[PDB]
Amino acid sequence: MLTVEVEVKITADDENKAEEIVKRVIDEVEREVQKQYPNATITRTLTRDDGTVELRIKVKADTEEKAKSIIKLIEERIEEELRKRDPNATITRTVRTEVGSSWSLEHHHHHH
Fold this sequence. Notes:
Blueprint: E1 2-11, H1 15-33, E2 41-49, E3 52-61, H2 64-83, E4 90-95
Antiparallel strand pairs: 1-3, 1-4, 2-3
Helix pairs in contact: 1-2
Protein backbone atom coordinates (compact mmCIF):
# COMPACT_ATOMS: atom_id res chain seq x y z
CA MET A 1 0.00 0.00 0.00
CA LEU A 2 1.10 3.63 -0.76
CA THR A 3 0.24 7.14 0.57
CA VAL A 4 -1.29 9.84 -1.75
CA GLU A 5 -0.97 13.58 -0.96
CA VAL A 6 -3.12 16.20 -2.76
CA GLU A 7 -3.72 19.91 -2.04
CA VAL A 8 -7.39 20.82 -2.52
CA LYS A 9 -7.65 24.65 -2.50
CA ILE A 10 -11.20 25.41 -1.28
CA THR A 11 -12.41 28.95 -2.17
CA ALA A 12 -15.71 29.97 -0.44
CA ASP A 13 -17.44 33.22 0.70
CA ASP A 14 -16.54 32.57 4.37
CA GLU A 15 -13.18 30.73 4.88
CA ASN A 16 -14.19 30.46 8.60
CA LYS A 17 -17.48 28.63 7.76
CA ALA A 18 -15.74 26.77 4.87
CA GLU A 19 -13.29 25.36 7.43
CA GLU A 20 -16.25 24.35 9.70
CA ILE A 21 -18.23 22.48 6.98
CA VAL A 22 -15.20 20.75 5.36
CA LYS A 23 -13.93 19.63 8.86
CA ARG A 24 -17.22 17.86 9.77
CA VAL A 25 -17.84 16.54 6.21
CA ILE A 26 -14.45 14.72 5.88
CA ASP A 27 -14.92 13.23 9.39
CA GLU A 28 -18.49 12.01 8.48
CA VAL A 29 -17.22 10.57 5.16
CA GLU A 30 -14.13 9.12 6.97
CA ARG A 31 -16.15 6.75 9.20
CA GLU A 32 -18.07 5.55 6.08
CA VAL A 33 -14.83 4.96 4.06
CA GLN A 34 -13.19 3.08 7.02
CA LYS A 35 -15.85 0.30 6.68
CA GLN A 36 -15.33 -0.04 2.85
CA TYR A 37 -11.50 0.13 2.98
CA PRO A 38 -10.33 -1.02 6.54
CA ASN A 39 -6.59 -0.45 5.85
CA ALA A 40 -7.13 2.98 4.18
CA THR A 41 -6.07 5.84 6.50
CA ILE A 42 -7.70 9.26 5.92
CA THR A 43 -5.63 12.23 7.13
CA ARG A 44 -6.43 15.92 6.43
CA THR A 45 -4.89 19.35 7.22
CA LEU A 46 -6.91 22.60 6.67
CA THR A 47 -4.49 25.59 6.44
CA ARG A 48 -6.04 29.02 5.61
CA ASP A 49 -4.06 31.19 3.12
CA ASP A 50 -5.23 34.55 1.54
CA GLY A 51 -8.97 33.70 2.22
CA THR A 52 -8.71 30.15 0.76
CA VAL A 53 -9.07 27.05 3.00
CA GLU A 54 -6.14 24.95 1.71
CA LEU A 55 -7.14 21.36 2.49
CA ARG A 56 -4.16 19.00 2.13
CA ILE A 57 -5.58 15.42 2.04
CA LYS A 58 -3.29 12.44 2.79
CA VAL A 59 -4.94 9.06 1.89
CA LYS A 60 -2.77 6.00 2.68
CA ALA A 61 -4.56 3.27 0.62
CA ASP A 62 -4.00 -0.11 -1.14
CA THR A 63 -3.32 1.53 -4.57
CA GLU A 64 -3.23 5.15 -5.90
CA GLU A 65 -6.43 4.48 -7.95
CA LYS A 66 -8.40 3.42 -4.83
CA ALA A 67 -6.90 6.41 -2.94
CA LYS A 68 -8.10 8.82 -5.73
CA SER A 69 -11.57 7.24 -5.39
CA ILE A 70 -11.58 8.28 -1.68
CA ILE A 71 -10.12 11.77 -2.49
CA LYS A 72 -12.67 12.43 -5.27
CA LEU A 73 -15.79 11.45 -3.22
CA ILE A 74 -14.47 13.77 -0.42
CA GLU A 75 -14.04 16.60 -3.05
CA GLU A 76 -17.65 15.91 -4.16
CA ARG A 77 -19.11 16.19 -0.63
CA ILE A 78 -17.00 19.13 0.75
CA GLU A 79 -18.07 21.31 -2.26
CA GLU A 80 -21.78 20.15 -2.21
CA GLU A 81 -22.49 20.95 1.51
CA LEU A 82 -20.46 24.20 1.28
CA ARG A 83 -22.02 25.43 -2.05
CA LYS A 84 -25.51 25.30 -0.40
CA ARG A 85 -24.71 28.54 1.57
CA ASP A 86 -21.44 29.76 -0.07
CA PRO A 87 -22.34 30.43 -3.82
CA ASN A 88 -18.66 30.78 -4.99
CA ALA A 89 -17.64 27.50 -3.23
CA THR A 90 -15.19 25.87 -5.71
CA ILE A 91 -12.37 23.35 -4.87
CA THR A 92 -9.02 23.18 -6.79
CA ARG A 93 -7.21 19.77 -6.98
CA THR A 94 -3.40 20.28 -7.03
CA VAL A 95 -1.56 16.92 -6.68
CA ARG A 96 1.61 17.18 -4.47
CA THR A 97 2.79 13.57 -5.16
CA GLU A 98 4.30 12.56 -8.57
CA VAL A 99 4.52 8.85 -9.53
CA GLY A 100 6.94 8.28 -12.43
CA SER A 101 10.55 8.34 -11.16
CA SER A 102 12.32 7.03 -14.31
CA TRP A 103 15.85 5.53 -14.32
CA SER A 104 18.56 4.74 -16.89
CA LEU A 105 18.69 0.91 -17.35
CA GLU A 106 22.23 1.04 -18.86
CA HIS A 107 23.45 -2.46 -19.83
CA HIS A 108 26.56 -2.79 -22.05
CA HIS A 109 26.19 -5.94 -24.26
CA HIS A 110 29.63 -7.45 -23.35
CA HIS A 111 29.80 -11.29 -23.48
CA HIS A 112 32.31 -13.93 -24.75
